[PDB]
Design a protein around this nucleic acid. Structure first.
Ligand SMILES: [Mg+2]
Ligand SMILES: [Mg+2]
Ligand SMILES: [Mg+2]
Ligand SMILES: [Mg+2]
Ligand SMILES: [Mg+2]
Ligand SMILES: [Mg+2]
Ligand SMILES: [Mg+2]
Ligand SMILES: [Mg+2]
Ligand SMILES: [Mg+2]
Ligand SMILES: [Mg+2]
Ligand SMILES: [Mg+2]
Ligand SMILES: [Mg+2]
Ligand SMILES: [Mg+2]
Ligand SMILES: [Mg+2]
Ligand SMILES: [Mg+2]
Ligand SMILES: [Mg+2]
Lengths: 220, 87, 25, 182, 144
RNA sequence: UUCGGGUCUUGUAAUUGGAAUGAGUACAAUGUAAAUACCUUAACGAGGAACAACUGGAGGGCAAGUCUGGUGCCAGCAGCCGCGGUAAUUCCAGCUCCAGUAGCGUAUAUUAAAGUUGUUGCAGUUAAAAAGCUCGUAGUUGAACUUUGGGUCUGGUUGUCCG
RNA sequence: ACCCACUCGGCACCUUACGAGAAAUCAAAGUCUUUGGGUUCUGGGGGGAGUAUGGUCGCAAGGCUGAAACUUAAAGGAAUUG
């Protein structure tokens, strides 16, 4: 296709120059991503599918002005998820911008073992939870190959995550798909927010990629 | 974190706050990483050699960022008696 | 309707029923 | 009053009856292996779930515990004797990793298909149903039969069957009689 | 921290509190009071026979304009009278006056279904034969 | 070079062939106290293989039609939301399709869903719900403190290095 | 009697979310799916209904206790745009 992608931010300039090789460097230093093309460059195989299209109306003096809210989940099934929620006039544009936001909001997840680690991680590391609106989602580790015991939206979010086995429990008005998916997103991103005995030792604070490679930014 | 044979399966072993030992989230868009330049005998800032402190977004939001940095710099011999361990 | 006036109407129905019972007690 | 012998269910219909992806997967598995109904996949999933409940219960117990040893190695030896679990992964942690397709694969239907004496899966189903394949001189008219490793080498057409060598059968005998008469 | 007691010797009040709160439900209260046996047209009965008294149709609710063709039936088991609904296009004519009819539940836990007011019972069989067999002309009324 | 052989395979056609087999009948024999019935098996027993599989549904929940004709807020359907007012994806039919399948549909009861009984594990400012307030028997609960250390020997069990 | 500093107790108040909520908002309505300091009372969709009945208190007014039959797909809370 046709894509030039002139980089307008320093992170984008470094990525376009090919100086950042893995998305782990972006996630580690809590770097701010504002160009989805960075995420496209780092993760070439981010699959996605629209969770829901919802018509939302505003009551004006003349008729009812209706837009559409698209709930898109993007991921690579290898420990990377993003949840975009967008509102727009035309449904196709709403889906495109929701994909854009979801790519912007990619996040890493910490898959773990239920017990007696043998192969690659199959489940989460610990129990995690999130709460959006009144919807509280509780993700609990499950034994190997136990499937994803979750509602279809949460199940498909875990599938996009790469988590193959997990138990779930949702409390509240899980009816609303955006709230449920946001709570699940909060939980799965909180999976890397739990300090664990195997994460106890301190590191040397490797210098930030835009400090060591500040020269290649700042287009002169 | 560790596979049974002994190879790492974790990705991006995360940083931790240098003042509260709490990990830094990937999307913790309040946290900062300060660099303090090493100084040689005649006061010339040696380039490319410094010391880094990762301050979390939580302490910055609370308002204890500057105090924590004061203590942390005093411990590693940067500032003279700027922070007293007994308030 | 107000709960006050529904209460009062119930009280007046009890008025009539209590007088009737007192007549026939 | 005589002591009852216990009948018991052997399948469990799923909770969500109209899951599109699940229905498509069930139809894929039914067409791949010539299953008559979708109760077959329910039965294999129920067997997998019983095995898996046992496996997880034994996993919960402490390592080097007599219950763990005895029942775990009993289950592993039974499954490797069936053939679904390869000898490489006799560990009781890969036993959780078995899928329904693994037990589907060990059916006498698919085994007759693999050996090549039946060139089609539905051909294997009918050939089994017509009392032709005998697993060690014993005719088996039952498609599933959970063929085990120690006896797979003894699948062939039965002697009473025309394929194993006998009188041909109704159609061919009648045609031979008609040709001899005229 | 919470309204309930938490001590190791507080089983008695926890149990009696649960027992007193259970009456707030409707299913538990119905099951324990035995309201179904005493007050409902059938006492814990899924089906019940009866005799047709008259042949009436009742108008529907506001959003739905029609007249649903029902029938008033006096129950034989105890003598109560209830309206019941004959479910299909041309089944009203099939049931005749003063014949035994087997009424069933209406599927909404003994409550009026849809737009039909003051009815709670279907009609499954008439004069020994089922409505569904008559409607597709698989069997015919014996006309006795 | 347009081709196009179909070079390599996979379906659709009332075309078309050769097979196999029971569901049934039935010499027998086995079976049984005697008989059925099952296992075996003579002789018959499949071409539309009429030896013909139904039960519900096709707006959403919920897999599958905005095809055709009929009726026109009628008839009726609809567990709930709803369809029916002259172009009905919902009623009555035909076609196609979907789900389970020798089973499927309904009714009541009940369990999981129900973190809508909440001990684990519910809520009480306004959604239902803090007695008007205080004392008080029973009930429930109730501050801290009374030998903690060490040294040796020694027995099993492990992971040790190797015999 | 004021002024400055501190402390205990009380009616209160401003800012803020780094916590909690469906939010309006709360410095408690926080320390609650990372769920357990002790303890009492109350609620299980709306209506019928705080009605009838049965007790009990009152001279009376009425107070306390207090359903069901039946009916209904909502009633209701906060906030957003008109
Ligand atoms: Mg009318
Ligand atoms: Mg049909
Ligand atoms: Mg129909
Ligand atoms: Mg139709
Ligand atoms: Mg559908
Ligand atoms: Mg039409
Ligand atoms: Mg509640
Ligand atoms: Mg109010
Ligand atoms: Mg209130
Ligand atoms: Mg109060
Ligand atoms: Mg006491
Ligand atoms: Mg004590
Ligand atoms: Mg109520
Ligand atoms: Mg009231
Ligand atoms: Mg009284
Ligand atoms: Mg309001």
């Amino acid at each position: 296709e046709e894509k030039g992608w002139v980089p307008v931010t320093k992170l984008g300039r470094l990525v376009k120059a090919g100086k950042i090789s893995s998305i782990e460097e972006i996630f580690l230093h809590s770097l701010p991503v504002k160009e989805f093309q960075i995420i496209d460059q780092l993760l070439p195989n981010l699959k996605d599918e629209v969770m829901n299209i919802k018509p939302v109306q505003k009551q004006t003096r003349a008729g009812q002005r209706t837009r559409f809210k698209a709930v898109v989940v993007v991921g690579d099934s290898n420990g990377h998820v993003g949840l975009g929620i967008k509102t727009a006039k035309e449904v196709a544009g709403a889906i495109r911008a929701g994909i854009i936001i979801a790519k912007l909001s990619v996040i890493p997840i910490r898959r773990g073992y239920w017990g007696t680690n043998l192969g690659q991680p199959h489940s989460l590391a610990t129990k995690t939870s999130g709460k959006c609106g009144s919807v509280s989602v509780r993700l609990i580790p499950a034994p190997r190959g136990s499937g994803i015991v979750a509602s279809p939206a949460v199940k498909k979010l875990m599938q996009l995550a790469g988590v193959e086995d997990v138990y779930t429990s949702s409390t509240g008005s899980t009816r609303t798909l955006e709230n449920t998916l946001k709570a699940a997103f909060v939980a799965i991103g909180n999976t890397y927010g739990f300090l664990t005995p195997n994460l106890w030792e301190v590191q040397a604070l490797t210098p930030s990629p835009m400090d060591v490679y500040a020269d290649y930014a700042t287009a002169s | 974190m560790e596979n049974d044979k002994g190879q790492l399966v974790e990705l991006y072993v995360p940083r931790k706050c240098s003042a509260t030992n709490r990990i830094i989230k990937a999307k913790d868009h309040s946290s900062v990483q300060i660099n303090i330049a090493q100084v040689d005998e005649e006061g010339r800032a040696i380039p490319g050699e410094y010391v880094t402190y990762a301050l979390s977004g939580y302490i910055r939001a609370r308002g204890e960022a500057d105090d924590s940095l004061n203590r942390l710099a005093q411990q590693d011999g940067l500032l003279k008696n700027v922070w007293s361990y007994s308030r | 309707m107000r709960a006050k006036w529904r209460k009062k109407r119930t009280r007046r129905l009890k008025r009539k029923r209590r007088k009737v019972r007192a007549r026939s007690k | 009053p005589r002591a009852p012998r216990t009948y018991s269910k052997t399948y469990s219909t799923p909770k969500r009856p109209y899951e599109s992806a699940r229905l498509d997967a069930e139809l894929k598995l039914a067409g791949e292996y010539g299953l008559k109904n979708k109760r077959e996949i329910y039965r294999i999933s129920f067997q997998l779930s019983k095995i898996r409940r046992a496996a997880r219960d034994l996993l919960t117990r402490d390592e080097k515990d007599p219950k763990r040893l005895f029942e775990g190695n009993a289950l592993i030896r039974r499954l490797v004797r069936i053939g679904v679990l390869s000898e490489d992964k006799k560990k009781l942690d890969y036993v959780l990793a078995l899928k329904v397709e693994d037990f589907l694969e060990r059916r006498l239907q698919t085994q007759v298909y693999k050996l090549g004496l039946a060139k089609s899966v539905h051909h294997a189903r009918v050939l089994i149903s017509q009392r032709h394949i005998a697993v060690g001189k014993q005719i088996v008219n039952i498609p599933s039969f959970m063929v085990r490793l120690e006896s797979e080498k003894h699948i062939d057409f039965a002697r009473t069957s025309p394929f194993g060598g006998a009188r041909p059968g109704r159609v061919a005998r009648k045609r031979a009689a008609a040709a001899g008469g005229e | 921290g919470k309204g309930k007691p938490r001590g190791l010797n507080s089983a008695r009040k926890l149990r009696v509190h649960r027992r007193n709160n259970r009456w707030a439900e409707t299913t538990y209260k119905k099951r324990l009071l035995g309201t179904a046996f005493k007050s409902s047209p059938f006492g814990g009965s899924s089906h019940a026979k009866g005799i047709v008294l008259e042949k009436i149709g009742i108008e529907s609710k506001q959003p739905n304009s029609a007249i649903r063709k029902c029938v008033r039936v006096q129950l034989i088991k105890n003598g109560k009278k209830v309206t019941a609904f004959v479910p299909n296009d041309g089944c009203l004519n099939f049931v005749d006056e003063n014949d035994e009819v087997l009424l069933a539940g209406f599927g909404r836990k003994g409550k009026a279904k849809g737009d039909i007011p003051g009815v709670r019972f279907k009609v499954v069989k008439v004069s020994g034969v089922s409505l569904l067999a008559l409607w597709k002309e698989k069997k015919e009324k014996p006309r006795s």
